[PDB]
Each structure stands twice: as C-alpha cells, then as structure tokens.
Design a protein around this motif. Structure first.
Motif, PDB file in Angstrom:
ATOM      1  N   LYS D 161       0.835  -1.160   0.000  1.00  0.00           N
ATOM      2  CA  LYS D 161       0.000   0.000   0.000  1.00  0.00           C
ATOM      3  C   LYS D 161       0.910   1.263   0.000  1.00  0.00           C
ATOM      4  O   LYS D 161       1.726   1.448   0.904  1.00  0.00           O
ATOM      5  CB  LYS D 161      -0.954  -0.103   1.184  1.00  0.00           C
ATOM      6  CG  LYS D 161      -1.554   1.227   1.651  1.00  0.00           C
ATOM      7  CD  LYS D 161      -2.382   1.049   2.933  1.00  0.00           C
ATOM      8  CE  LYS D 161      -2.859   2.368   3.523  1.00  0.00           C
ATOM      9  NZ  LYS D 161      -3.934   2.210   4.522  1.00  0.00           N
ATOM     10  N   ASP D 189      -3.214   4.994  -1.156  1.00  0.00           N
ATOM     11  CA  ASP D 189      -4.060   5.587  -0.161  1.00  0.00           C
ATOM     12  C   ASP D 189      -3.808   7.074  -0.139  1.00  0.00           C
ATOM     13  O   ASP D 189      -2.670   7.488   0.084  1.00  0.00           O
ATOM     14  CB  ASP D 189      -3.794   4.965   1.219  1.00  0.00           C
ATOM     15  CG  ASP D 189      -4.712   5.613   2.218  1.00  0.00           C
ATOM     16  OD1 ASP D 189      -5.456   6.556   1.933  1.00  0.00           O
ATOM     17  OD2 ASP D 189      -4.664   5.048   3.386  1.00  0.00           O
ATOM     18  N   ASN D 191      -5.727   9.361   1.741  1.00  0.00           N
ATOM     19  CA  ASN D 191      -6.214   9.966   2.958  1.00  0.00           C
ATOM     20  C   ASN D 191      -6.886  11.294   2.754  1.00  0.00           C
ATOM     21  O   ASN D 191      -6.583  12.229   3.479  1.00  0.00           O
ATOM     22  CB  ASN D 191      -5.102  10.072   3.992  1.00  0.00           C
ATOM     23  CG  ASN D 191      -4.817   8.708   4.594  1.00  0.00           C
ATOM     24  OD1 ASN D 191      -3.693   8.184   4.532  1.00  0.00           O
ATOM     25  ND2 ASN D 191      -5.863   8.094   5.141  1.00  0.00           N
ATOM     26  N   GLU D 214      -7.548   4.012  -2.103  1.00  0.00           N
ATOM     27  CA  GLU D 214      -8.209   4.247  -0.853  1.00  0.00           C
ATOM     28  C   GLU D 214      -8.354   5.759  -0.560  1.00  0.00           C
ATOM     29  O   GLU D 214      -7.398   6.548  -0.718  1.00  0.00           O
ATOM     30  CB  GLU D 214      -7.372   3.460   0.166  1.00  0.00           C
ATOM     31  CG  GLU D 214      -7.908   3.455   1.587  1.00  0.00           C
ATOM     32  CD  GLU D 214      -6.891   2.850   2.469  1.00  0.00           C
ATOM     33  OE1 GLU D 214      -5.822   2.428   2.015  1.00  0.00           O
ATOM     34  OE2 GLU D 214      -7.239   2.850   3.731  1.00  0.00           O
ATOM     35  N   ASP D 239     -12.442   4.281   3.418  1.00  0.00           N
ATOM     36  CA  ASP D 239     -11.968   4.140   4.767  1.00  0.00           C
ATOM     37  C   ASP D 239     -12.653   5.213   5.612  1.00  0.00           C
ATOM     38  O   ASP D 239     -13.691   4.981   6.282  1.00  0.00           O
ATOM     39  CB  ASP D 239     -10.413   4.297   4.764  1.00  0.00           C
ATOM     40  CG  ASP D 239      -9.715   4.447   6.111  1.00  0.00           C
ATOM     41  OD1 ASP D 239     -10.293   4.543   7.169  1.00  0.00           O
ATOM     42  OD2 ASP D 239      -8.405   4.452   6.017  1.00  0.00           O
ATOM     43  N   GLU D 240     -12.086   6.421   5.532  1.00  0.00           N
ATOM     44  CA  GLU D 240     -12.607   7.559   6.291  1.00  0.00           C
ATOM     45  C   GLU D 240     -14.103   7.626   6.221  1.00  0.00           C
ATOM     46  O   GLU D 240     -14.796   7.766   7.222  1.00  0.00           O
ATOM     47  CB  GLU D 240     -11.941   8.874   5.844  1.00  0.00           C
ATOM     48  CG  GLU D 240     -10.500   9.070   6.416  1.00  0.00           C
ATOM     49  CD  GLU D 240      -9.379   8.673   5.500  1.00  0.00           C
ATOM     50  OE1 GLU D 240      -9.364   7.615   4.894  1.00  0.00           O
ATOM     51  OE2 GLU D 240      -8.398   9.545   5.449  1.00  0.00           O
ATOM     52  N   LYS D 263     -11.796  -0.369   9.760  1.00  0.00           N
ATOM     53  CA  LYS D 263     -11.049   0.184  10.883  1.00  0.00           C
ATOM     54  C   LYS D 263     -11.959   0.137  12.100  1.00  0.00           C
ATOM     55  O   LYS D 263     -12.843   0.993  12.286  1.00  0.00           O
ATOM     56  CB  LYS D 263     -10.579   1.614  10.639  1.00  0.00           C
ATOM     57  CG  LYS D 263      -9.174   1.622  10.111  1.00  0.00           C
ATOM     58  CD  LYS D 263      -8.605   2.997   9.774  1.00  0.00           C
ATOM     59  CE  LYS D 263      -7.395   2.841   8.827  1.00  0.00           C
ATOM     60  NZ  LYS D 263      -6.758   4.094   8.410  1.00  0.00           N
TER      61      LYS D 263
HETATM   62 MG   LIG Z   1      -6.862   4.706   5.038  1.00  0.00          MG
END
Ligand SMILES: [Mg+2]
Ligand SMILES: O=C(O)CCC(=O)c1ccccc1C(=O)O
Ligand SMILES: O=C(O)CCC(=O)c1ccccc1C(=O)O
Ligand SMILES: O=C(O)CCC(=O)c1ccccc1C(=O)O
Ligand SMILES: O=C(O)CCC(=O)c1ccccc1C(=O)O
Ligand SMILES: [Mg+2]
Ligand SMILES: [Mg+2]
Ligand SMILES: [Mg+2]
Lengths: 367, 368, 367, 368
Positions: D161, D189, D191, D214, D239-240, D263
């Motif tokens: 990743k 990713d 973010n 991601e 994710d978030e 998560k």
């Molecule tokens: Mg993440």
C-alpha cells in the motif's frame, strides 16, 4: 406430412344483430376458410381478417392474395411440413399474420388429427371448461344497452365487455354500474379510439372498478400506453398492439400493459399465441382470450387455447348464438357460464357440409 | 390416460473416463430412472440428480423418496393425467424440480408414444440434426488438457467448453487458445466456483474471445451476476440460476444474463424447458442445451429439445461414447459434428433390457 | 470442540388445536431433534422442517437423510469444531438450510454452555424480555375466528397475525378490525398463496391499516413482490423468500420488502439469522422473529434472538401452551405480553427426559 | 458484569522510522490505552486517535475528555454491562467513535476473558493465520521508496500500500511497478488528498493495475466517490467515509465503493466492525483490515478480526516491528507473510509493564 393443396373458401354469415365498434358497424361476417389437404386427411383454418382494413391493415381480399400467391405456394414447395415449420417457411414474407395464422391452423389441425390429438392437448390445456364473457357493441341508446347487457347477464355470462368510443364512455359505464351493481365484471374496449390527450377523459372511469381498458390508443403507441397507465387507475390491456410474444415482452418491459388479450390470428398463429401466453405468465401478466367473431372453427380453437393455465380472466369466448343463428359446426352452447373444451382430434369440430355450402360465396383450390 | 404406476430403478454406469468439475471428481454415474405405466403404454423418465447434493440441493436418494412418497402418489391419485397437468398436480410440493421433471418426462414419453408423436414434434423442432459441443473437465496438467481437447476436436466436436475453477482459469484458456487457435468455439464453466470479489481474475479471460462464462457465481446470486458482467468482457451464461422461465425472465430483465443454458431437469421438465426457450427468444437471449451426463434417454430428449429454433449455440449434446462405453439405448454417434434428431414416437429411443438390467442396482414398483 | 457424535430423535407432539395455513391443516407436529455430543457436554438442536414439503422443499425425512449421510459425517470428520466453522464445513452441500441450521444450533448450544454463555449473550441481546404476538390460523367461520382472536387478545398477546388465503382475506380482516378495533396490531400471512394478478384483491386490504402482508407471493418471486408493493398499501413482508442475509440485501435493494421476518432455520442457523438482522438493520428494515411451531428448544433460542436490537416488531414467540399442552422443556409463559430471555448457558433450556421419551418415536446414533 | 472503573493511560512510542501521510509526517505515536476493571478481571482497550485531528476530527485529548466525562461514567452507572450493551448505553452521545470503540474494546476483552473466549471466536474467525501487507509512506525520493519497498517485499509482505498525495502519485507508482513488477499487489491511499476535479490525474494510474485507491476524496464526499468511480479504472476503496455499517450500505448502494477498508475504531468498535463485514459480504463487497499504527493490543484484535471470512484482501496488519522496536506485548512476527491469530481468551495478549511504564506518560483512574 406433405401438402397436397388448400382450398380457399370465402364465406358470408349474417350476424344475429349488428355489431358496432369504434371502427364501425357490422351486420354480416365475411370470413375466409382454408381446407388443407394432406395425404392423410384435411385440416381446417379460419382467418380473422374482415372485409376492410379497419382493425388492422389486413383485410379478406389482401389475405386471399398473399395466401394464394405467396404463402400457400411456399408451403407446397417444401418436402416436410409441420405446423411448427410453417413459420420458418413463411418467414421471408413480411407481416400478414392473420393469414399466416390461418394457414398454420389448417396445417395444425390436420397434423393434430393425424396423431389423434386435440388442439387442447397440443396447447397444454389444464382445464376442461372455460368461463366465458361477452363483448357488447356500441349502442344507440343507453337504455337499449342496459337491456342487452341485462340479457347477456341472464344468459349466464360471467363478464361484460363494453365497446367504447369518444362519446360513449363514462355514461354507458356509469349506467351499467349503477343499474347492474359493482359486483359484475366490467371492462371496456376502445379499439384505438383515443389519444394520450384524452387521458382526463379516460381518467373519468377510474371510479368504476373496471377490470381493464383495452387498446385505448393506437397499435403502434406503446410508450403512450405506458404514459397513459400513469395517468389512469384503470388497468391497461393491449390487443391490437400485441402482434407477438416479443411485442408482449417489450410492452411489458416498458410498463405499457398489465393484462394481455390474446388473439391467435393477430399474433399469427395458435403456436405463437401459446408463446405469448408463456411470456406473459413469466412476467406475472394475466392473459385472456380475445375474439374475432369467428365460426365454430376458430371458436373451437380459441376455447382450447383459453383453457391454458395463464388465462385467468374470462375471454371473448361467447356461445355460438351470440353472433350466429346457424353456425357451420356443432354449435357452442353456454353452460354454467362456461364453454366446454373440445375433446376430439385437431379442432374437435368440423363444418357441417350442408351448412358450409349454403354460406359459401367463393371457392378456390390451390394445388 | 390414467397412471397405473411407476417403476423406480437405480442404475450404475461407469464413465469411460473420470469427470472433474469445480464440485468434484467423478468416475461412475449413479442414475435414477422411471418407467411410468399407463393403460396406453410405458414411458421413460431419467433424473439428473447425482449421488450427493453438489451441483444443487437435489440428490438421487432424495429424489427417490419424494417421488415415492409424494409425487408419484399424487399423480396416481388423479382421474386424468397429461404431461401438461403434471405440474399443477405436483404444485403443492415445494421445489424438487429435478424429480418432478423426471416424472413429467416419463408421463410425456408415454403420452407421446400413445399419439405416436415424437418429442421433437411436440416441442417444436425446426431442424433434424444438431451441432454438438463437448464439455471438458479439470485436468491435472495443461498438456493433458491439451491433448484431450485435441482429440475431441478431431472427433469433430464444434465447440469446446472448459470446466474451470480458481487455479484453473486463465492458464488452461491461454494454453488452448494458444495451441488450437482463435477460431475454435471456446467457453468455460465455473459451476459457482467464484465470487464477485473474483472479478479481477475473471476479467483476466477477457482477451481470449470466450463465447461465454457459465455460472461464475452461486445459484442465488443474480444481482452479482449483473454486477459481474459490468466488470467483465466475457459474456455471462447462467445454468444453476435458471430454475424456471420466470427465473430466466427475472435475470434477463436484471441484465444478469446474456446467454442461457437450458437444462430440462433443472427447470422441472421438458415442458418448462420449452417455456424458458420461448421466454429467452422473446427477449433476444440465445440459448443452448445443457447436459447432465445422461443416458441415451435424457440424451435423446435433449437432442430434440436442442433442435428448437432459439438454440443457436452448440449444446452439451455429445455422443454417447463421451461418457459411456455401453449405452442402455441405441447410442448417439457424431456425424459431421452433429447428432441426428430422433424420429420415433416419444423419446424415439428406449432401453435395451439386457443392457439395462445389467446396470440396474435397485428396482421398485410404485402403484396405488 | 471435537465432535463425538449426534443423536437423532424423532418426536411427535400433538397440537392443542389444529393449525390451518394456506398450505393446509395440522393437528400434530413431527419434529426432528439433535443432541450433539462433545467430550465436554451435549448440545440440542431442533429442525423446523415438517412432515411434507409444503412451506418449503424441506421435509423431516429429507432432513434426516442429509444430516445422516452428509452433514453429520462432515463435521465428525473435522479436527476442530466451531459453530462458526460449521458453515464452511458443510458448504459443499447445496441447500438444506433447515437441516444445517439445526445442526449448527446443536453445536452452538454445546459450545456456549461450554463457555458458560447464553444464546442471547452470544447473539448480542439488549433486552431481557420480548413482546409476543400470536399466529392465528384459518378458521371455518368468522365467529370462530373472532372468538379465537378474542381469546388470544385476553391472554395478553401484543399483536395479531392472521393466516389468509384466497377466499379468506378481506372478510376475516374486516371482521377483526370491526370487532376488535383499529388499535390492535394486525398483520396477515398468505404463505405464497397469491399471484401478482391477485393484487387488486390484496389492494382490497389497504383500508384496514395492517402492519404487513407476509409473503403474498411465491418464494422465488422477488421482483413480483417489488411490483406488488407498488400496487398495494399494505407493507410487504417476506418470510419464505428470505433464505439468507444476501437474499435479504437483494430484496431490499430491489424494493421488494419493507419488513423482514427472521426464521433462523429458514436461513440456515442462528448465526446467519444474526447476520440477516444486521443487514436489515443497516438498511433501515425492521425485523421480527418468525416461528415454526417449535418446542421449548427452538422457542428458547428464538426468544434470545428476538431480543436483538432491530427486532422492533412483536414476533411469533407465543407461549408454549399456544401449541402444546406439555412441552419437553420448561414451558414459556406469557407475563404481560412478554416472555423472558433465558439466562442460563447455551439455550438456557433443556428437555425434560421424562417428557422427551414420552414424545420420542425414533432415535439414532451417529458417531 | 459490573464495571468497576477504568484506568486511562497515555502512552508514547517512538516510531522506527517516520511515517509520512497526506496529512503529515509522524516520528512518534501517542496512544491512549484503557484498562477496564471488573469483578471478574480486566480488559484492555486501545484508541486509534492521534495527537491532532488530521485523519478525522478525533484526537487523543478530545477522547480523554469525552471518555472521562461522558462515556466511562455512562457505563459505570449501569447495572449490567455487556460489550453489546455498551453501544446503546453511549448512544445519547453523538460521534466519538474511536473513543467508544476503545472503551468497548476494553469491556469486550474483559468479558471474553471471563468466558475464556478469544476475540477471534467471538467474531467468528474461520482462519488461523492471516496474510499481511504493509502501508508505505511518502518518501522524499524514488530510490528511497523503491528501496523501502523492496525491503518490505523481502521480509515477505504480500501486498503493498503506497501513500499518495498530489505530486506523489503516478511517479511513485510508475517506479514501483516498473522496478518490482506487475505481479505485485499494489494499492494506494490518499487519505482524502484529492478532489473530483483531480480525476484526470487519478485517471493517470489506470494503467498500473492497482487493486484499489483508498479514500481519494473527503470523508463526506460519497457521491463524489461514485462519480469518481465512473471516471477512473482503479477500484474505489473507502476508509474515512466508512463510519458505520449503515454508511457502508449507503456507499454500496450509491456505487461509491467496491472494496471496503475496515477500521474497528473508526466505525466505533469491533462489534460494529463485524457488522460492516457482514453487510459488505451480503453485498459481494470484499473487505480488508485497516491499521492505525497500533500496539500489540489493537494489533491482536485486528488480526482476529481480519480472520473473518470476508477478509479476502491482505490487511494493514503488519508485524509489530514495522513501527515499533519494542511493543508493550509479545510482538507480532511475520511468518511466511502471515500473522497468527491469537488463541487465548480475550485479546490473547497483554502488556508487559516496564515495557508499559517505560512508555506511559500519564495515568488516571475513573471510578464510581
Ligand atoms: Mg486509510
Ligand atoms: O368474438 C367475440 O366474441 C367478440 C369480438 C370483438 O369484440 C371484436 C370484434 C372485431 C374486431 C375486434 C374485436 C375486439 O375484441 O377488439
Ligand atoms: O452432459 C454433458 O455432456 C456434460 C455435463 C456437464 O458438464 C455437467 C455435469 C454435471 C453437472 C453440471 C454440468 C454442467 O454442464 O454444468
Ligand atoms: O410458531 C409459531 O408461532 C407459528 C408460525 C407459522 O405461522 C408458520 C408455520 C409454518 C410455515 C410458515 C409459518 C409462517 O410464519 O409463515
Ligand atoms: O497500521 C498500519 O499498518 C498503518 C496505518 C496507516 O497507513 C494509516 C496511519 C494513520 C492514519 C491512517 C492510515 C491509513 O491507513 O489510512
Ligand atoms: Mg380488442
Ligand atoms: Mg453448466
Ligand atoms: Mg410466514
């Protein structure tokens, strides 16, 4: 089988009483019959076309012609004939379903007789009797209508179907409902009489609990039907529009129909009509047998057809007398508002020679 | 007619060569046959269930029980019987399509025979011979696979179907396309071995020009199939999922299927099967005839079925000897990659008693 | 754990009052029970199948066979055994949910008792008691029916569920609404008896404020339900169709269901049930516990489950005596329309041998 | 159970090597652990917050507060306490998922230990080991990266990743594909670093065969993601945005995500997490285990979690030594690229105090 030849007869039969639809008036019935001849025996076919091209583009004379010059010959040229192969054999010719439909029937009847199987067995009948409804024409007066209705209901009829027109909608209906009660099974048929623009008008019927409204808009107007369905509470039923199983599926997919009228010649054959039935069933669409003021020949076929599992609504499978004083076969007689499914091979019915001759107007043998 | 009774036989037939699919390895076929007895004559039905419940929930022992204790009895309990009336008659019993289809087959054959009509005539055949493809199992080696495939091609088969499974996908396909060329009719069959999560893998076959992918997902996942198709270039073909003409219309409308595999027993009968055919045709969905390692009985019924107009893709209607050295009927022999449609009444075929008796392991007669 | 064996019993329990669904009338209940054996202790499992394949394709004898020959043996063969692992372990076998569910249950109970954990604890209960409704069958007469609701109403049952069929819809309902009021919690259950074509009739129930209509159509007709839901006011509830959490997800997605009935055996186990619950929850679909006229065994694990957070509607968790005079376990008794979640380990119940043997017809060891 | 109190601790563990994200560079991790105290025994929790509100609006100090003043009290005042009941108890308090998650974690661990059950078992693990990947940060230079990467590859890590950001996308990726090969499991990713408007840039990775990308966009931008999915070839991973099961559902339904990153803290606890897993599974959405640079504590729960059936992709479940020289529990050690699922009750792990006290910075006891 091998086709030896067909005999084309023109027939004229007088109606007990004049029949009025949105396209016009009928006092007499001009049919077209076929006598298929194969080495084993004969089969009979009846054509649903009428004098002129008012319900659809097909009319008696155009039928005869295509049959004579194109279809029949086409069959005569092949080695093996089977009802099923008729289609593929006649596929190069565009349209002309009622005529192809006619040919198919004769062939089929003959085919079925040879094996000594009834139309019903072949089609997949699950019943032995079928509930019958009746189609009532456009009246000149409400009162005269109420009578007629009342008459039919008395005869044992299970459902009332009213021919409608701009200027003969709500009132006739209001009238019947009011007089005869809400419990009766009532539906209407516009034979393409209205336009999408007439929605509010038709929406006027909402309050009446009609089972359906049959072909309000033109044949080609599928999307319009879907739109109209959106605007009215009355269930859309398609007749003219249904020229095939594919057509039924398209209409169903587009939301243009909720209930289907099945007319065998319209769809070009009893074989095709079965598929139509199958397709609808698969989509949860109810079907019912439609009528074309036929002799005991088509009548007999229709009755068999109508005993199929998805025909869950009474059909325009009225008794013989509703249109003819003297039917060319054993007559069909209502019993407990039902009609019995023929048991004999092929149609399970045949013309009474004496009788046939009387009303024959022309005759041709194509060999 | 009126049902006199049915004879239930258990037959054991060895495969000339073991068959491997995603669900198991098979060296012997275990069948369930029915001889339905009517005043008019006998009829033969074959059941497509197998020993265990691996392709679907139905299995030999289960089919037998239900037939015995519920289905058969229910038909016997009727005044009239027709193939067409079998359905409505057994409708109270949920599922068991394979069993019902088998029972329907027997009745139908007897009925057809009585009217001296052939299955093909009844179903509506338009052709007199059909193109045959072959179903190739999972091999232990590519080379091995290549040879097998090679041979079938040689016998004159018109298309190849490859059993696949995670770890036997792309390679085997690459190897065949590669060795035999792009002009061969090639397709694969997962037998529900993948998941939606497997798309990227499946998308890997994109480049091979595969006719189709048969049942990548599980039987109940119609929507996943629609999703999957949006993800791959290979066309989706359903088998297991197509349990009825209604299932078929549902999946089509859902865009979960583009090509349908018709399996008579899987859909509850030859009658249902025709409907499915008809439903597909009206939706522009091509069909093709599925196989279940049947004896000549089912094979023949399938050949007829497969001569119907919408069957525009070669089906798993191989010659008898693909599975069996000695069939229990007049074997089916490939002729120019084709098989001839049967002419006689009913199946157009029937078991040779000594032949049959020899493979018979159990027999029972169920009457009133 | 390590599976030692399983004991398969056949039990026969008479019904206090014959039960009539759209699939028929039942006076007696044959059940299939399972006693899982571990070096540790025992586990109990109950199978929701019945004598014949009327609700579903699964039936007692069918279940016995697959358990015996495929399922039970599959587990035994495994080194370590976790209720969890059961699924994976039997995945190779297609269908057989009810069967698989009982087995899981039997395993789970052992496992839990072994960790001295209750069904409710493992499942995630948040409640300590649950509102109980009652499933009322089809009656011969309305008065009969009425008395019957009346009676259950008095016992303190929180909600009423009426079995319907074509010929037993509107009226029976008109009846209880009219007699019992509009504030009663009323819902119906057709157990797949209608067709998309019967919508109009079902639309006839729009006026009675039912909370739901449980499975008007066949098991396989999901899209039919979605359509159906577009044609009636009464909320759609699926039972039969909900075979798994995926099924549920699917149905929801398609707009075919609004409320879901969770039947642990129907979906393949208590674990799967939980999953359905969650899925439903995540989609804002309320759920409620369904019942299959079980023993205190089934009843106990159902009460547990029905304590889950999303179970926002009274489930078919009636009191023991609703069906049985004498239950093989400590009966379930209605305290203010509720029932107490079991506190002991595993189910929290056990069969009273004396009672069991009394109702046992056959037994078999599988190790 | 009855909750007796919670001892809160501040921990500060230095990172092996500074880890750079789209939100900032980290050199030391500052955690917040929980020690729940029961009649029975004690359980541990671990909070995923960080020093500041950069991944989300939750941060260590904010957490402390809510916990202390709102959360912990909430449960203390309760008669019976169940990991399950923890949720409904704290429902009146809006948000603070990571915080409630840690709490529930602590509680759960106690309960499980009481019944002598493992986290794994509770969750329903079906596996014993899990495959592990690693999360690689933004490097200041290619070779740097290239080097790091290869390093990790060597230690056996199964998937890679890469941390991306505008100006650190294509190139890095290009370089690693280039250098290490195409057979490598590679994902990125961001973010929340990008915008819909950046699609063309992100469309630039189409060619690299990444498993996923991601969180390209902001937490709140689901629709954006769905649109974005439309514009790029790389599968969207959220994710978030995945703050709950319901969130997961919605995202799915809207076509905003294809694979989900789970998560447990972010979603409010291991239980929710499970639910998200199930939800995803019922939608045919693969899931994977996400990491928040956790101790041996969070690491052990994750590993159990990650053994759930729908975890078909390697998680950010790297060995202890990826970040920490000295974990406060028996370290996690890669073995063949996998990690072994804990076998004892509860987490099946616990700290080693000097290890612990050496890192602790604070301590507070919260009681009734
Ligand atoms: Mg993440
Ligand atoms: O045959 C019958 O019983 C009635 C037939 C009928 O109403 C009709 C007659 C001629 C043309 C069209 C139609 C029609 O149903 O639309
Ligand atoms: O009948 C044949 O020719 C081969 C049949 C086959 O491949 C098969 C055999 C068993 C179960 C499923 C299938 C299948 O085609 O899906
Ligand atoms: O256990 C109970 O309380 C009765 C449950 C019931 O009515 C039922 C019984 C058999 C099949 C289906 C159903 C149903 O709830 O639909
Ligand atoms: O725990 C790990 O293995 C690394 C976790 C990671 O990359 C990360 C670290 C801090 C905040 C967010 C993320 C992330 O994965 O999004
Ligand atoms: Mg008409
Ligand atoms: Mg297949
Ligand atoms: Mg129900």
């Amino acid at each position: 089988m091998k086709l030896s030849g067909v005999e084309l007869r023109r027939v004229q039969m007088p109606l007990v009483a004049p029949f009025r639809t949105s396209f016009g008036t009928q006092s007499v019935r001009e049919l077209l019959l076929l006598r298929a001849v194969t080495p084993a025996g004969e089969g009979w076919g009846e054509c649903v076309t009428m004098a002129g091209p008012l319900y659809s583009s097909e009319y008696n004379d155009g039928a005869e012609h295509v049959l004579r010059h194109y279809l029949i010959p086409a069959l005569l040229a092949a080695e093996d004939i089977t009802a099923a192969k008729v289609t593929p054999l006649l596929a190069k010719f565009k349209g002309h379903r009622m005529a192809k439909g006619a040919l198919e029937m004769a062939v089929l009847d003959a085919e079925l007789r040879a094996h000594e199987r009834s139309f019903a067995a072949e089609l997949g009948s699950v019943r032995d009797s079928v509930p019958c409804g009746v189609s009532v024409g456009i009246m000149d007066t409400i009162p005269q209508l109420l009578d007629v209705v009342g008459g039919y209901l008395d005869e044992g009829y299970v459902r009332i179907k009213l021919k409608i027109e701009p200027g003969w909608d709500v009132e006739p209906v209001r009238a019947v409902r009011e007089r005869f009660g809400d419990d009766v099974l009532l539906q209407v048929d516009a034979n393409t009489a209205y336009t999408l623009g007439d929605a509010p008008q038709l929406a006027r019927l909402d309050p009446f609990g009609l089972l359906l409204i049959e072909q309000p808009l033109e044949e080609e107007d599928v999307l319009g039907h879907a739109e109209l369905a959106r605007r009215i509470q009355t269930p859309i039923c398609l007749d003219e529009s249904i020229v095939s199983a594919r057509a039924a599926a398209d209409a169903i997919k587009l939301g243009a129909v909720q209930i289907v009228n099945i007319k065998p010649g319209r769809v070009g054959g009893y074989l095709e009509a079965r598929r139509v039935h199958d397709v609808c069933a698969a989509h949860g669409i109810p079907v019912w047998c439609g009528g074309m003021i036929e002799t005991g020949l088509g009548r007999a076929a229709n009755v068999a057809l109508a005993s199929l599992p998805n025909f869950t609504l009474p059909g325009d499978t009225s008794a013989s007398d509703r249109f003819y004083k003297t039917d060319i076969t054993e007559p069909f007689v209502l019993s407990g508002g039902h009609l019995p499914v023929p048991t004999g091979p092929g149609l399970g019915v045949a013309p009474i020679p004496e009788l046939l001759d009387e009303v024959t107007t022309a005759k041709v043998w194509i060999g």
